[PDB]
Amino acid sequence: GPGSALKRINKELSDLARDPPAQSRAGPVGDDMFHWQATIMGPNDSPYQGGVFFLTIHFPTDYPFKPPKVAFTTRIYHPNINSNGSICLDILRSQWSPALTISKVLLSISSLLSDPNPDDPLVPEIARIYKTDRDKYNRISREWTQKYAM
Amino acid sequence: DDMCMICFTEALSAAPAIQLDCSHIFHLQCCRRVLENRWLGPRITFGFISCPICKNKINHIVLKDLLDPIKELYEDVRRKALMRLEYEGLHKSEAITTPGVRFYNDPAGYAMNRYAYYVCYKCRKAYFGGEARCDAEAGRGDDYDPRELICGACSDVSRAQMCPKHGTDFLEYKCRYCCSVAVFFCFGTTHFCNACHDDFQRMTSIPKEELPHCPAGPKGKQLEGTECPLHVVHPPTGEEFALGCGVCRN
Amino acid sequence: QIFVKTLTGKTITLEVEPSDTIENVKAKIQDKEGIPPDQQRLIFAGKQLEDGRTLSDYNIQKESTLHLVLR
Ligand SMILES: *S[C@H](CC(=O)NCc1c[nH]nn1)S*
Ligand SMILES: [Zn+2]
Ligand SMILES: [Zn+2]
Ligand SMILES: [Zn+2]
Ligand SMILES: [Zn+2]
Ligand SMILES: [Zn+2]
Ligand SMILES: [Zn+2]
């Protein structure tokens, strides 16, 4: 049951740190194998460049039939991540498949920083700035990157 | 390899396995769990029935017991959604008629994306719960109680005058506290929209005359302006009100 | 020749010459599993590939792996 979820979490870990996804680290933070920490580096081409961003990950008892709870603990200026570090990502909600792995989530989150989605935004203010004034969006993103993520 | 691509815990060689109509192969026992769990949270979605891999619907003789009630719910919802989209006059919508956008030529697809449906606990049919917000879609998971989801007909607190065309099949209520279609029905008396339910402790406490008046947003906001979001006359915020049949005014 | 992993593991194969623009690799992607270039992103080594750059713009060599993520 949870022993099943655990065998799967250990597999994902072993698979991971022995072939990490580009610009991310992730792993258990204690002896509790259901609670992970992760980092995503700001992608090279983005205003987040050079930032290190910390995430929290909670795996459910019936993984991977339910997705993990994933959040930012680093403050970040982005249309699809709120001030609580909640991420608007389909594959974490309605579009979750048990075929997905943490590698794929982190890769997916990283892409989201490379390229935000303003159309159905979680923070409609930042969404607006992005669509109307890009120069501004970068400045604030980089500025936030400098305050919070370096 | 011989790895089961649902639970990466295995080679298929290990226990009961099956090949879906789609072609690729999984543990029988894994496919069943995927189909028993259904969707995440209260709002009916059908992501879970596609193939982990090729994302064509999962199909098999051995799985018909699970798939059968699902196809019927999917049918029910596709039906209700597509109807609502047409009535709402959004089937000609540009997000359907533009080649290379997500739901090009997919009116049903667009509508089921746009609308939020819930399984009623009393009867067992889907009912409409409003446009799907993003804010609800990065909120809780299943820290919710299915007994509190109840279609308009099963929560008729306003002994409402039925629609001659569609009986009570598409009857919907206002949130008690704002100008939104309701989703939940708690303490067998009180209809709440998604946001107000989240915050029901507060909402219940606010004195009735201190609530926002029409036009009223969730969680106590006063929306600017003069036209009601529901395009209806209704009693002041804080009183129950049956909105009527959902298709026939939309 | 190079590969393309979908998020959900499904791998697909393409014949390509270096100078191939990622424009037409998104196109050559449609020809096989039939998705609109306009919905698909390509990720290589954590870089989101820009439409109309070559592959050896990105140092993509014989038998490399990209990832298709889509909105
Ligand atoms: S989590 C948030 C919704 C969102 O960010 N995106 C929805 C979407 C649909 N197609 N592309 N993005 S409230
Ligand atoms: Zn399995
Ligand atoms: Zn398949
Ligand atoms: Zn009912
Ligand atoms: Zn009617
Ligand atoms: Zn409300
Ligand atoms: Zn109103």
Short mmCIF file of C-alpha atoms and ligand atoms in Angstrom, two decimals:
data_model
loop_
_atom_site.label_atom_id
_atom_site.label_comp_id
_atom_site.label_asym_id
_atom_site.label_seq_id
_atom_site.Cartn_x
_atom_site.Cartn_y
_atom_site.Cartn_z
CA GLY A 1 0.00 0.00 0.00
CA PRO A 2 2.33 2.79 1.25
CA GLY A 3 5.05 0.15 0.92
CA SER A 4 4.06 0.21 -2.75
CA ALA A 5 4.31 4.00 -2.98
CA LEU A 6 7.64 3.76 -1.20
CA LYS A 7 9.08 1.20 -3.63
CA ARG A 8 8.10 3.69 -6.39
CA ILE A 9 9.55 6.72 -4.61
CA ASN A 10 12.87 4.92 -4.05
CA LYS A 11 12.95 3.96 -7.74
CA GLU A 12 12.38 7.58 -8.77
CA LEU A 13 15.15 8.77 -6.46
CA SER A 14 17.64 6.17 -7.63
CA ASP A 15 16.69 6.99 -11.25
CA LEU A 16 17.07 10.68 -10.56
CA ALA A 17 20.29 11.60 -8.74
CA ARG A 18 21.91 9.05 -11.11
CA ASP A 19 20.88 11.16 -14.16
CA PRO A 20 19.38 14.45 -12.86
CA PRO A 21 17.04 16.61 -15.01
CA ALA A 22 18.82 19.68 -16.37
CA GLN A 23 19.13 22.46 -13.73
CA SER A 24 17.27 20.69 -10.91
CA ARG A 25 18.03 18.78 -7.70
CA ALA A 26 15.51 16.90 -5.56
CA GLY A 27 15.55 14.40 -2.70
CA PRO A 28 14.24 13.42 0.78
CA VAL A 29 15.22 15.86 3.45
CA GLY A 30 15.01 13.43 6.35
CA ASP A 31 14.33 9.72 6.84
CA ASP A 32 10.71 10.43 5.86
CA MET A 33 10.70 9.36 2.24
CA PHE A 34 7.37 11.16 1.47
CA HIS A 35 8.75 14.63 2.09
CA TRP A 36 11.28 15.96 -0.45
CA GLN A 37 13.09 19.20 -1.11
CA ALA A 38 14.01 20.39 -4.59
CA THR A 39 15.81 23.22 -6.35
CA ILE A 40 15.24 24.55 -9.86
CA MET A 41 17.77 26.95 -11.37
CA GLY A 42 16.41 29.92 -13.28
CA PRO A 43 16.71 28.85 -16.97
CA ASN A 44 19.57 30.53 -18.89
CA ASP A 45 17.34 32.56 -21.20
CA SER A 46 14.87 33.84 -18.56
CA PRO A 47 14.90 36.83 -16.15
CA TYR A 48 15.25 34.18 -13.43
CA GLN A 49 18.76 33.31 -14.64
CA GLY A 50 21.28 32.67 -11.88
CA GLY A 51 18.53 32.23 -9.29
CA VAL A 52 18.32 29.11 -7.17
CA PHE A 53 14.68 28.30 -6.34
CA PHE A 54 13.62 26.01 -3.54
CA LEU A 55 10.52 23.80 -3.69
CA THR A 56 8.69 21.55 -1.27
CA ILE A 57 7.23 18.16 -2.37
CA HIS A 58 4.73 15.97 -0.48
CA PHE A 59 3.99 12.51 -1.91
CA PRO A 60 0.56 10.91 -1.07
CA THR A 61 0.24 7.42 0.48
CA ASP A 62 -1.09 6.04 -2.82
CA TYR A 63 1.56 7.44 -5.12
CA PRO A 64 1.63 7.43 -8.03
CA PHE A 65 -2.13 7.15 -8.44
CA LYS A 66 -2.43 10.67 -7.03
CA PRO A 67 0.11 13.43 -7.92
CA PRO A 68 2.53 15.02 -5.38
CA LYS A 69 1.86 18.36 -3.62
CA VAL A 70 4.53 20.70 -5.05
CA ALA A 71 5.18 24.33 -4.08
CA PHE A 72 7.76 27.09 -4.17
CA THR A 73 9.31 28.11 -0.87
CA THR A 74 11.37 30.79 -2.67
CA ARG A 75 9.41 33.95 -3.45
CA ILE A 76 9.10 34.35 -7.22
CA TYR A 77 7.47 36.88 -9.53
CA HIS A 78 5.54 34.81 -12.08
CA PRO A 79 1.96 34.79 -13.52
CA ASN A 80 1.35 31.12 -12.64
CA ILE A 81 2.85 30.95 -9.15
CA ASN A 82 1.24 32.81 -6.21
CA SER A 83 2.66 34.34 -3.00
CA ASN A 84 2.17 30.97 -1.26
CA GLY A 85 4.30 29.21 -3.88
CA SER A 86 1.34 27.42 -5.45
CA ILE A 87 1.90 26.44 -9.07
CA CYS A 88 -0.75 26.47 -11.78
CA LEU A 89 0.32 23.34 -13.56
CA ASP A 90 -2.14 21.00 -15.28
CA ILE A 91 0.00 17.88 -14.84
CA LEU A 92 -0.28 18.32 -11.05
CA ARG A 93 -4.08 18.37 -11.18
CA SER A 94 -6.46 17.23 -13.93
CA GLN A 95 -3.71 16.02 -16.29
CA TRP A 96 -1.76 13.79 -13.88
CA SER A 97 -0.72 10.34 -15.11
CA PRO A 98 1.09 7.70 -12.95
CA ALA A 99 3.56 7.49 -15.82
CA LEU A 100 4.87 10.90 -14.81
CA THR A 101 7.80 11.18 -12.44
CA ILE A 102 9.31 13.95 -10.32
CA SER A 103 11.92 14.36 -13.06
CA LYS A 104 9.04 15.15 -15.42
CA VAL A 105 7.39 17.51 -12.98
CA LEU A 106 10.61 19.44 -12.39
CA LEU A 107 11.33 19.57 -16.11
CA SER A 108 7.77 20.81 -16.56
CA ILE A 109 8.03 23.51 -13.86
CA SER A 110 11.35 24.66 -15.27
CA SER A 111 9.78 25.05 -18.72
CA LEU A 112 7.03 27.09 -17.08
CA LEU A 113 9.66 29.59 -15.92
CA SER A 114 11.16 29.61 -19.43
CA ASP A 115 7.79 30.55 -20.84
CA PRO A 116 4.84 31.62 -18.64
CA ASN A 117 1.19 31.19 -19.62
CA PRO A 118 -0.77 34.47 -19.20
CA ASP A 119 -4.07 33.23 -20.66
CA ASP A 120 -5.46 31.51 -17.56
CA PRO A 121 -3.17 33.10 -14.91
CA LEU A 122 -3.13 32.42 -11.17
CA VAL A 123 -1.83 35.95 -10.51
CA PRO A 124 -3.75 38.14 -13.01
CA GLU A 125 -1.79 41.28 -12.10
CA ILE A 126 1.59 39.87 -13.16
CA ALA A 127 -0.25 38.26 -16.04
CA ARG A 128 -1.26 41.74 -17.21
CA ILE A 129 2.22 43.26 -16.92
CA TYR A 130 3.63 40.34 -18.98
CA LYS A 131 1.16 40.82 -21.86
CA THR A 132 1.39 44.63 -21.99
CA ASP A 133 4.98 45.46 -20.96
CA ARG A 134 7.65 42.78 -21.26
CA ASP A 135 10.63 44.99 -20.42
CA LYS A 136 8.93 45.74 -17.07
CA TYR A 137 8.17 42.07 -16.43
CA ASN A 138 11.83 41.11 -16.85
CA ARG A 139 13.05 43.95 -14.64
CA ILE A 140 10.76 42.96 -11.75
CA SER A 141 11.47 39.26 -12.27
CA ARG A 142 15.22 39.83 -12.23
CA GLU A 143 14.88 42.27 -9.36
CA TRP A 144 12.93 39.66 -7.35
CA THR A 145 15.46 37.04 -8.43
CA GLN A 146 18.19 39.26 -6.88
CA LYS A 147 16.29 39.83 -3.60
CA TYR A 148 14.94 36.35 -2.93
CA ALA A 149 16.82 33.76 -5.01
CA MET A 150 20.49 34.75 -4.69
CA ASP B 1 11.99 -3.17 -21.00
CA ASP B 2 9.46 -5.51 -19.36
CA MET B 3 8.62 -2.53 -17.10
CA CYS B 4 4.93 -1.68 -16.45
CA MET B 5 4.70 2.01 -17.38
CA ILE B 6 1.96 2.79 -14.72
CA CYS B 7 3.69 1.57 -11.53
CA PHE B 8 7.42 1.67 -12.33
CA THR B 9 7.69 -0.93 -9.57
CA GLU B 10 7.60 -3.90 -11.93
CA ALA B 11 8.16 -5.99 -14.95
CA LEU B 12 4.83 -7.09 -16.43
CA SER B 13 6.15 -10.67 -16.13
CA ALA B 14 5.38 -10.45 -12.39
CA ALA B 15 1.60 -10.59 -11.96
CA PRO B 16 -1.70 -10.40 -13.98
CA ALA B 17 -1.24 -8.23 -17.11
CA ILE B 18 -3.32 -7.03 -20.11
CA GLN B 19 -2.97 -5.20 -23.43
CA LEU B 20 -5.41 -2.31 -23.96
CA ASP B 21 -7.20 -1.74 -27.27
CA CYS B 22 -4.69 1.08 -27.65
CA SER B 23 -1.95 -1.58 -27.92
CA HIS B 24 0.43 -1.11 -24.97
CA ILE B 25 0.48 -3.32 -21.98
CA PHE B 26 0.04 -2.84 -18.21
CA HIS B 27 -0.67 -4.87 -15.06
CA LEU B 28 -4.38 -5.59 -14.91
CA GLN B 29 -4.37 -4.65 -11.22
CA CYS B 30 -2.78 -1.24 -12.06
CA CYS B 31 -5.34 -0.28 -14.73
CA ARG B 32 -8.04 -1.07 -12.20
CA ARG B 33 -6.64 1.29 -9.58
CA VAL B 34 -6.34 4.06 -12.14
CA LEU B 35 -10.02 3.57 -12.98
CA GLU B 36 -11.33 3.15 -9.41
CA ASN B 37 -9.62 6.37 -8.24
CA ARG B 38 -11.15 8.39 -11.06
CA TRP B 39 -10.46 12.11 -10.88
CA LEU B 40 -8.83 14.33 -8.32
CA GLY B 41 -10.91 16.65 -6.16
CA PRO B 42 -14.68 17.33 -6.53
CA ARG B 43 -14.92 18.57 -10.15
CA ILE B 44 -15.47 15.78 -12.68
CA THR B 45 -12.58 15.50 -15.17
CA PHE B 46 -11.61 12.55 -17.42
CA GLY B 47 -7.85 12.91 -17.70
CA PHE B 48 -7.53 9.65 -15.85
CA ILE B 49 -9.18 7.47 -18.51
CA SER B 50 -6.62 8.20 -21.21
CA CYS B 51 -3.64 5.90 -21.79
CA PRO B 52 -0.66 6.94 -19.63
CA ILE B 53 1.28 6.82 -22.87
CA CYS B 54 -0.60 7.41 -26.15
CA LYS B 55 -3.50 9.13 -24.30
CA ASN B 56 -6.20 7.38 -26.32
CA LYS B 57 -9.08 6.22 -24.10
CA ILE B 58 -8.28 3.05 -22.05
CA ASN B 59 -10.28 0.08 -23.28
CA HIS B 60 -10.59 -3.65 -22.55
CA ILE B 61 -13.11 -6.46 -22.04
CA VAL B 62 -11.87 -7.09 -18.49
CA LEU B 63 -12.27 -3.42 -17.55
CA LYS B 64 -15.84 -2.88 -18.77
CA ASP B 65 -17.26 -3.03 -15.24
CA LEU B 66 -15.29 0.16 -14.41
CA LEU B 67 -15.37 1.81 -17.85
CA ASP B 68 -19.12 1.32 -18.22
CA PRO B 69 -20.30 3.69 -15.43
CA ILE B 70 -17.59 6.08 -16.64
CA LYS B 71 -18.62 6.19 -20.32
CA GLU B 72 -22.13 6.91 -19.03
CA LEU B 73 -20.93 9.83 -16.87
CA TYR B 74 -18.71 11.09 -19.67
CA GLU B 75 -21.78 10.83 -21.95
CA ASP B 76 -23.94 12.73 -19.46
CA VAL B 77 -21.39 15.53 -19.06
CA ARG B 78 -20.41 15.84 -22.74
CA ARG B 79 -24.14 16.10 -23.45
CA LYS B 80 -24.84 18.75 -20.80
CA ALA B 81 -21.67 20.72 -21.57
CA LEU B 82 -22.06 20.84 -25.35
CA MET B 83 -25.69 21.91 -24.88
CA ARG B 84 -24.71 24.68 -22.47
CA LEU B 85 -22.03 25.90 -24.89
CA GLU B 86 -24.51 26.14 -27.78
CA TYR B 87 -27.25 27.78 -25.68
CA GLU B 88 -24.58 30.16 -24.34
CA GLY B 89 -23.78 30.82 -28.00
CA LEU B 90 -20.08 29.88 -27.78
CA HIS B 91 -19.99 27.04 -30.34
CA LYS B 92 -19.00 29.49 -33.10
CA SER B 93 -16.42 30.77 -30.61
CA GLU B 94 -13.01 31.65 -32.07
CA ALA B 95 -11.19 29.05 -29.91
CA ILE B 96 -13.07 26.37 -31.85
CA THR B 97 -12.98 27.92 -35.38
CA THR B 98 -9.26 28.78 -35.44
CA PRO B 99 -7.05 26.02 -36.96
CA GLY B 100 -4.13 24.97 -34.78
CA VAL B 101 -5.60 26.17 -31.45
CA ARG B 102 -6.21 23.53 -28.78
CA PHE B 103 -9.87 22.70 -29.52
CA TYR B 104 -10.06 23.37 -33.26
CA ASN B 105 -13.30 21.64 -34.32
CA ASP B 106 -13.76 20.32 -30.79
CA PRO B 107 -16.88 22.06 -29.42
CA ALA B 108 -17.39 19.25 -26.86
CA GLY B 109 -13.72 19.47 -25.82
CA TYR B 110 -13.82 23.24 -25.35
CA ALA B 111 -17.03 23.10 -23.32
CA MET B 112 -15.94 20.37 -20.89
CA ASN B 113 -12.76 22.37 -20.33
CA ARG B 114 -14.69 25.59 -19.75
CA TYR B 115 -17.53 24.35 -17.51
CA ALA B 116 -17.26 22.70 -14.11
CA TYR B 117 -19.46 19.69 -13.39
CA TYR B 118 -19.96 17.74 -10.14
CA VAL B 119 -21.54 14.40 -9.31
CA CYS B 120 -24.65 14.89 -7.17
CA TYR B 121 -24.74 12.62 -4.13
CA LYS B 122 -28.56 12.26 -3.89
CA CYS B 123 -29.38 11.34 -7.49
CA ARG B 124 -26.19 10.44 -9.32
CA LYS B 125 -26.11 12.81 -12.26
CA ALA B 126 -23.68 15.61 -13.11
CA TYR B 127 -24.73 19.22 -12.51
CA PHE B 128 -23.20 22.50 -13.50
CA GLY B 129 -21.12 24.42 -10.98
CA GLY B 130 -19.94 27.48 -12.95
CA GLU B 131 -17.08 28.43 -15.28
CA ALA B 132 -13.97 26.61 -14.07
CA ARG B 133 -11.66 29.06 -12.32
CA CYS B 134 -7.89 28.61 -12.16
CA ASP B 135 -7.98 29.64 -8.48
CA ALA B 136 -10.03 26.57 -7.53
CA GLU B 137 -7.73 24.50 -9.83
CA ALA B 138 -4.64 25.33 -7.75
CA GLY B 139 -6.48 25.07 -4.38
CA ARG B 140 -7.22 22.00 -2.23
CA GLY B 141 -7.21 18.43 -3.43
CA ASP B 142 -9.80 16.09 -1.86
CA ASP B 143 -10.09 17.71 1.55
CA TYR B 144 -13.81 17.76 0.60
CA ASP B 145 -16.98 15.78 1.44
CA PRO B 146 -19.06 14.43 -1.51
CA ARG B 147 -22.25 14.54 0.55
CA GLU B 148 -22.22 18.34 0.19
CA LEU B 149 -22.39 18.27 -3.64
CA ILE B 150 -26.08 18.25 -4.57
CA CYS B 151 -27.70 19.22 -7.88
CA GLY B 152 -30.37 21.96 -7.94
CA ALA B 153 -33.26 19.47 -8.06
CA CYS B 154 -32.10 17.63 -4.90
CA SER B 155 -31.61 20.83 -2.94
CA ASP B 156 -34.84 22.59 -3.91
CA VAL B 157 -35.10 24.87 -0.84
CA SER B 158 -37.24 27.37 -2.85
CA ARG B 159 -40.00 24.91 -3.96
CA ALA B 160 -39.17 26.44 -7.35
CA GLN B 161 -41.42 26.81 -10.40
CA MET B 162 -40.27 24.13 -12.88
CA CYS B 163 -39.20 24.83 -16.45
CA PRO B 164 -41.88 23.57 -18.94
CA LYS B 165 -39.31 22.40 -21.54
CA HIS B 166 -36.58 20.83 -19.31
CA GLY B 167 -38.32 19.62 -16.13
CA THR B 168 -35.97 20.48 -13.25
CA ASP B 169 -33.07 18.77 -14.98
CA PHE B 170 -31.07 22.01 -15.37
CA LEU B 171 -32.20 23.89 -12.22
CA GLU B 172 -29.48 25.87 -10.47
CA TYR B 173 -29.22 27.97 -7.28
CA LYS B 174 -27.40 31.19 -6.36
CA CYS B 175 -24.63 31.08 -3.76
CA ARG B 176 -26.29 32.40 -0.61
CA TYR B 177 -23.47 34.96 -0.23
CA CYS B 178 -22.63 36.22 -3.75
CA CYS B 179 -23.66 36.46 -7.40
CA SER B 180 -22.50 33.04 -8.61
CA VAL B 181 -23.92 29.63 -9.43
CA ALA B 182 -23.71 27.42 -6.33
CA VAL B 183 -21.60 24.27 -6.03
CA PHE B 184 -22.04 22.95 -2.52
CA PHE B 185 -25.03 22.46 -0.25
CA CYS B 186 -24.11 22.22 3.40
CA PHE B 187 -26.00 21.65 6.66
CA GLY B 188 -28.85 20.71 4.32
CA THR B 189 -29.82 24.40 4.11
CA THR B 190 -27.11 26.53 2.58
CA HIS B 191 -25.78 26.82 -0.96
CA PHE B 192 -22.18 28.00 -1.43
CA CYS B 193 -20.06 28.79 -4.48
CA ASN B 194 -16.52 27.47 -4.53
CA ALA B 195 -14.69 30.40 -2.91
CA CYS B 196 -17.32 31.15 -0.25
CA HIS B 197 -17.30 27.50 0.76
CA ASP B 198 -13.57 27.73 1.24
CA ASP B 199 -14.27 30.55 3.66
CA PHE B 200 -17.56 29.45 5.14
CA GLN B 201 -16.59 30.16 8.73
CA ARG B 202 -16.21 33.85 7.87
CA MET B 203 -19.16 34.04 5.44
CA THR B 204 -21.61 32.65 8.03
CA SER B 205 -20.53 35.18 10.61
CA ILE B 206 -20.97 38.30 8.55
CA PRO B 207 -24.25 40.05 9.45
CA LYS B 208 -26.80 39.90 6.62
CA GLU B 209 -26.88 43.66 5.95
CA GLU B 210 -23.06 43.80 5.91
CA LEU B 211 -22.80 41.35 3.03
CA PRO B 212 -22.11 42.90 -0.42
CA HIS B 213 -25.29 43.66 -2.34
CA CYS B 214 -25.69 42.91 -6.06
CA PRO B 215 -23.35 42.97 -7.83
CA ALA B 216 -21.56 40.69 -5.31
CA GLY B 217 -18.27 38.79 -5.73
CA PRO B 218 -17.25 35.76 -3.57
CA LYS B 219 -15.73 35.97 -0.08
CA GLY B 220 -17.47 39.30 0.61
CA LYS B 221 -16.25 41.48 -2.32
CA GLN B 222 -18.40 44.33 -3.64
CA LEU B 223 -18.10 44.22 -7.44
CA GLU B 224 -18.13 47.64 -9.13
CA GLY B 225 -21.07 48.68 -11.26
CA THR B 226 -24.70 48.01 -11.74
CA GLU B 227 -25.40 44.78 -13.68
CA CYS B 228 -25.63 41.44 -11.84
CA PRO B 229 -23.17 38.66 -12.86
CA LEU B 230 -26.11 36.27 -13.08
CA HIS B 231 -28.22 38.63 -15.24
CA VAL B 232 -31.21 38.13 -12.95
CA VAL B 233 -33.21 40.05 -10.42
CA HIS B 234 -32.76 38.24 -7.08
CA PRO B 235 -33.34 38.76 -3.34
CA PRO B 236 -30.58 40.56 -1.36
CA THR B 237 -27.31 38.73 -0.76
CA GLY B 238 -27.78 36.37 2.15
CA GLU B 239 -31.10 34.80 1.05
CA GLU B 240 -31.48 31.55 -0.91
CA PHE B 241 -32.77 31.88 -4.43
CA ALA B 242 -33.49 29.40 -7.20
CA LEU B 243 -32.08 30.82 -10.44
CA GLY B 244 -34.23 28.65 -12.68
CA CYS B 245 -33.18 26.48 -15.62
CA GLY B 246 -29.55 27.01 -16.58
CA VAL B 247 -29.73 26.54 -20.35
CA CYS B 248 -32.92 28.55 -20.93
CA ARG B 249 -31.67 32.00 -19.81
CA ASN B 250 -28.07 31.34 -20.97
CA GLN C 1 18.55 10.76 -36.57
CA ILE C 2 17.41 11.88 -33.05
CA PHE C 3 14.72 10.94 -30.48
CA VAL C 4 11.85 12.85 -28.78
CA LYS C 5 10.52 11.81 -25.37
CA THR C 6 6.98 12.75 -24.43
CA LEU C 7 6.49 13.62 -20.75
CA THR C 8 4.68 10.29 -20.33
CA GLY C 9 7.57 8.23 -21.73
CA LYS C 10 6.33 7.70 -25.33
CA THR C 11 9.49 7.96 -27.50
CA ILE C 12 9.41 8.90 -31.21
CA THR C 13 12.19 8.84 -33.85
CA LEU C 14 13.20 11.39 -36.51
CA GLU C 15 15.81 11.49 -39.29
CA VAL C 16 17.50 14.90 -39.34
CA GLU C 17 20.54 16.74 -40.64
CA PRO C 18 22.23 19.29 -38.28
CA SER C 19 21.04 22.38 -40.14
CA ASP C 20 17.39 21.36 -39.54
CA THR C 21 15.41 24.33 -38.12
CA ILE C 22 13.44 23.60 -34.95
CA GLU C 23 10.50 25.06 -36.88
CA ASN C 24 10.51 22.07 -39.22
CA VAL C 25 11.41 19.63 -36.44
CA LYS C 26 8.14 20.68 -34.84
CA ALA C 27 6.65 20.16 -38.29
CA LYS C 28 8.41 16.80 -38.79
CA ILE C 29 6.90 15.98 -35.37
CA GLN C 30 3.35 16.53 -36.66
CA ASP C 31 3.97 14.16 -39.59
CA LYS C 32 4.52 11.31 -37.15
CA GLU C 33 2.25 11.75 -34.11
CA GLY C 34 0.26 14.65 -35.57
CA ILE C 35 0.21 17.61 -33.17
CA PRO C 36 0.06 21.35 -34.12
CA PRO C 37 3.54 22.97 -33.78
CA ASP C 38 1.67 25.80 -32.09
CA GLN C 39 0.92 23.71 -29.02
CA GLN C 40 4.29 21.99 -28.63
CA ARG C 41 7.52 23.12 -26.91
CA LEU C 42 10.87 21.37 -27.24
CA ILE C 43 13.23 21.20 -24.28
CA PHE C 44 16.87 20.24 -24.68
CA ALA C 45 19.28 20.27 -21.73
CA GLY C 46 16.87 22.55 -19.92
CA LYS C 47 16.70 25.04 -22.81
CA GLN C 48 13.36 25.76 -24.52
CA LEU C 49 14.26 25.63 -28.24
CA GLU C 50 13.54 28.77 -30.30
CA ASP C 51 11.59 28.44 -33.57
CA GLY C 52 13.94 28.97 -36.51
CA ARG C 53 17.30 28.14 -35.02
CA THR C 54 19.32 25.17 -36.29
CA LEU C 55 19.96 22.09 -34.17
CA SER C 56 23.73 22.62 -34.12
CA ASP C 57 22.75 26.11 -33.01
CA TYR C 58 21.99 24.17 -29.82
CA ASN C 59 24.85 21.62 -30.21
CA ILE C 60 22.32 18.83 -30.83
CA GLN C 61 24.26 15.82 -32.14
CA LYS C 62 23.58 12.33 -33.55
CA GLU C 63 21.16 10.35 -31.36
CA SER C 64 20.22 13.05 -28.81
CA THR C 65 16.96 13.32 -26.80
CA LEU C 66 14.49 16.22 -26.63
CA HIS C 67 11.31 16.47 -24.57
CA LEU C 68 7.91 17.48 -25.86
CA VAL C 69 5.92 19.44 -23.31
CA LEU C 70 2.69 21.07 -24.54
CA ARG C 71 0.20 23.66 -23.21
S1 LIG D 1 -3.01 26.95 -12.32
C1 LIG D 1 -3.90 28.21 -13.18
C2 LIG D 1 -4.29 27.81 -14.61
C3 LIG D 1 -3.13 27.93 -15.63
O1 LIG D 1 -2.09 28.46 -15.22
N1 LIG D 1 -3.14 27.52 -16.97
C4 LIG D 1 -4.25 26.87 -17.71
C5 LIG D 1 -3.91 26.56 -19.15
C6 LIG D 1 -4.64 25.97 -20.17
N2 LIG D 1 -3.86 25.90 -21.36
N3 LIG D 1 -2.68 26.44 -21.07
N4 LIG D 1 -2.67 26.85 -19.74
S2 LIG D 1 -5.22 28.94 -12.14
ZN ZN D 2 1.83 -2.00 -12.78
ZN ZN D 3 -1.83 3.48 -25.32
ZN ZN D 4 -29.38 15.31 -7.73
ZN ZN D 5 -35.32 24.82 -19.64
ZN ZN D 6 -20.23 32.80 -3.10
ZN ZN D 7 -26.59 39.80 -8.34
#
